[PDB]
Structures are given as structure tokens and as C-alpha cells.
Design a protein around this nucleic acid. Sequence first.
RNA 1: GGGCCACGGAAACCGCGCGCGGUGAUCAAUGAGCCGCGUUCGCUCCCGUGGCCCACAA
RNA 2: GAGCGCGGUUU
Lengths: 120, 317, 53
Amino acid sequence: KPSYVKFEVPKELAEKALQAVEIARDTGKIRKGTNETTKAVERGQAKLVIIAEDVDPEEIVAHLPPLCEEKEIPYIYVPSKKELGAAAGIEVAAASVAIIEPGKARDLVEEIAMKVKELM
Amino acid sequence: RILPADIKREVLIKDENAETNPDWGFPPEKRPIEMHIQFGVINLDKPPGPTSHEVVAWIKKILNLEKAGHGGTLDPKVSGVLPVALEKATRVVQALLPAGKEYVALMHLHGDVPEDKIIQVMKEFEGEIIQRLRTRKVYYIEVLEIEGRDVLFRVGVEAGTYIRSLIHHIGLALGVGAHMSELRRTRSGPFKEDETLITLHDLVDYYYFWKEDGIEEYFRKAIQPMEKAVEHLPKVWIKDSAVAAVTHGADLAVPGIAKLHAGIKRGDLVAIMTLKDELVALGKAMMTSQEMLEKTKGIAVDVEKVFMPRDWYPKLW
Amino acid sequence: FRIRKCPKCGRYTLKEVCPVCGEKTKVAHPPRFSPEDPYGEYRRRWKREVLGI
RNA sequence: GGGCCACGGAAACCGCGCGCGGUGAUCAAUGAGCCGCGUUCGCUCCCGUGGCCCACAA
RNA sequence: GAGCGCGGUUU
Ligand SMILES: [Zn+2]
């Protein structure tokens, strides 16, 4: 798997992540696509960055992990960018997605940040 | 899968006794990084988007270069092999321009045609063609995959052939029409898709690795010696005592040849090398390979473009 | 973009597995580059760690 | 006289295309539409200015 | 100046 993927994420962990982006869409606030996602991180608006593992070319997102660490923002890997797009409410893929305001997936996201804390 | 640049040449020996002095000149891998660049060529993998001209302009500003030129222009949407000569090597693009190219194209049919019809009709474009007016040669066409209206194929052509035009004419021959939806140049003369083919990101990142970290490795590999740009030309190798004369505008007389390729005919474009395989100059042959070999006097090559600096080799005359 | 290439064999294909070698294919074209290179600083950071610098 | 090398042989605006910034879309989020700013290398003949040589390779 | 390699108007 790609070099920009810096740890292994268990099915369950990455499954919660899609639920988070799911629920944050219709009750909270998200941004979708690597450009909006990267603006969100550099403006310090992003709570959790979700990055898809199947991005080709890597360079599209390879800058996101180092960026997030600089800014001290949690990020996680979901397996597929097709389903990451579907979860953000679009019929097209999404290489990356930021959750800006958690909404009802408020606790769900506190947890996800915990599990990734360890994975580092 | 064969272009005329691929033909193998025989080396004929004129002076078996000729040796080279290792204190003179700089073979490609004995060059300080700064000199490597001055006489370097980039095998760039152009990205889709920018024109070839813009791409080169970025390279100049980002590497802080005075001069640079590309070989065969690639269209904005096309990717692949774009050779970029730097600095004092810039004029070698003139050696690259006449040489043949190879592409991988994606053709889209405007109607349905059987896979066997397609393959058979494309087969017929091998050989000469003429496009809108002039004549151009197609060395080979290979259909890799057909997926309904999408036809993926490789093509080898003479310099000048427009792939758009060609795909259009194939569309007419099939009747339903066709357009090119994707193009990538995979070879341009001595430049090919190999480990030397470097993208812009890799290129500018390697530059910083060297300029801002003291790491020289990665950027050195990014630059090829200008000699690379001449791998496909017939060569004549000269004795050390003629090298300085020739960088000084002297024509190359027969007594200074140590070794040459066979096949050279008068008028031919030839690369003049030293016995260390540094490139001295480009020239036009005044003699055939056999004439240069049997004679003991006369001008064998008119020297026209001099690349090597005058002080690499001593003034032995 | 539809043109893909086997990293192992060098084969050009539209499929996600090399029909020759069986390897997974990657898109043939290089990523777009910007003269401004907004995130170069961070891509390089990633890249140093990849090349063991 | 000849050869080689260097510099020169125009400049400002518009459109297209592309890049960035902004916004961020009823199958282009690997970025649509709209807005603003950017943006196209050189080569070969000849002519001028200047520099280095005149070297059948010892 | 004349060619080979982005379309339209200005002295
Ligand atoms: Zn194979």
C-alpha cells in the first residue's frame, strides 16, 4: 500500500470514520476534495482529516499527513475514495475530506482521534 | 517496434595506436555538478496542462538558469518525453529535431466497428502517409487494446507527423470518424521512458535536496550529459591533438581521426567525439566513411557547431 | 484519464491489472505541477522520509 | 580574407489555453460554472557589433 | 531581416 499511508487502520476504525463523515454531512459541517480539505487544515478549521488509501498519483494527497502534523490535526485512512465521496454526499469520488464541525457525530469523532493517537 | 535511430553501427578503426590523456577534458562522470548542469539535458516527463514553452520557462526560473530549450514541441494536453537542453548544451536540440518519435494514443470511435476491422484498417497506415500539405512516414502501428469505441495503440513516426491528423484519417477510413482523447509521447530520438525520465516534482525536489541539503546524488541523476542527445548520430572519434583545434573552428582533416562509424555518406550530420566520449562538435560530413578511412589528407568533416570549451584540451598545434 | 501502465513490465493498458505480468497498474500521465508549488515544503517532507534521507 | 563563440535583429493591448488565489457544483471534488491576477522556450540560414583562432593533428 | 518551431487589433 502507498507510501503516504503511514499506519494500518482496522476495518472497524475506518468504518466509524465513514459514519462520522456521513453524520457530519447532514447535521454538521464538512469539506470535500483535496483542495477544500487542504484549505481547511491550513486555516485551522479542520477537526478530523479523512484520507483515502487508493489515491493515484500519490502526490495528490501525499502532502496531507505532514501538513496535519504541523498543524496538530488528527487524520485517518479510509480504504476507498469512491465510498468516501458517497459519504460526503456526492456521486463522485473524494480523495480527501475534512470534518469542520462534528454535529451529531461529536462523540464518535472524539473516539476516532483517540484510536489514531495510539496508531502513531 | 523499430525506428531508424535504432540501427546499430559498425565502428571502423583508423588509428589503432591512438590513446587518450586522462589529464585532459572532463568525461561526463568526472564533471563537478555545476559543470554537469552547464552541459546537461533533462529527459522530462511533461505533464498534461501547460505548453512545452511554459514548462521550459518554469524550469529556468526554478533552477535559476540563463538558457534552455526543448526538442519537439508537445501540445498542452499531451504528456511524456520532452527533452530539455540546458545552458551551453541548448543548441544540441538541433540534433534531436529530425529524429523519430513514438506515442501511445487513445483513439475514440464515433460509431461501432468490429475489432478485426479496426486492427486491419490501422495496419494499412504503416508506410508513407500525407497530411494537411506534406508526406510523412509511419514506421509501425500496434493496437494494444480495444474496448468498444476506445482503441489504445502505439505508433512510431517520422518527426513532424501529427498524431491528431493521423487518428482523424483513421476515423475516415473506418467511416464512422474518430478523435484522439489522450496522447503520451514515449520516445523522442535517444530519449525513452526509462529511469532517467523524470517528472517536474521529482526534478524540483531533487534540486532542493542538493541546493538546500547538500545532497548531490538525486539531482545529478536528474541531468544527463549532453552526449546522451547524440547517441543516435553517426560518430567520428578524434585524436587528442586535434580536439583543441576543432573547438577553435578548425575543420577536421583526415589525419585527426582515430575511429569512426561506418555508413557515413557526404552531407550527413555527424557527432565529433573525443576518445573519452565527450562531445566536441556537430558537423557535416565531406567524405564517406570509406573515404575517411583510406585517405591520408583532406577535410573529412566541416565543423559547424562547437560545444566543448576551448580550454579543456591544450593547444597541441 | 484512462491510459494506465504496469510498473513491473512497462505495459500500457486500460485495465487495473497488467494482462502480461499481473501487477496492479497506475495512471500513465504525471501529476499536474504548479510553478507556485504551494505545498512543496510538505511534499518534500514526505519525500525525504521515503528516500531515507 | 576564412572558421568558431557571444550579444542584437522590436514593443504595448485583446481573445483562446493553462497556472495560482477566491467560491466550491444535479456522474469533472484528481475541481464545474463565475470572479481577479498571472502566463508561452528556443533552433537554423543571413546582417551588424565585439571576442578567440587560422590549427591536415605533430 | 528570411525560415522552422498559440488566434485579433494598435506606432
Ligand atoms: Zn509482464
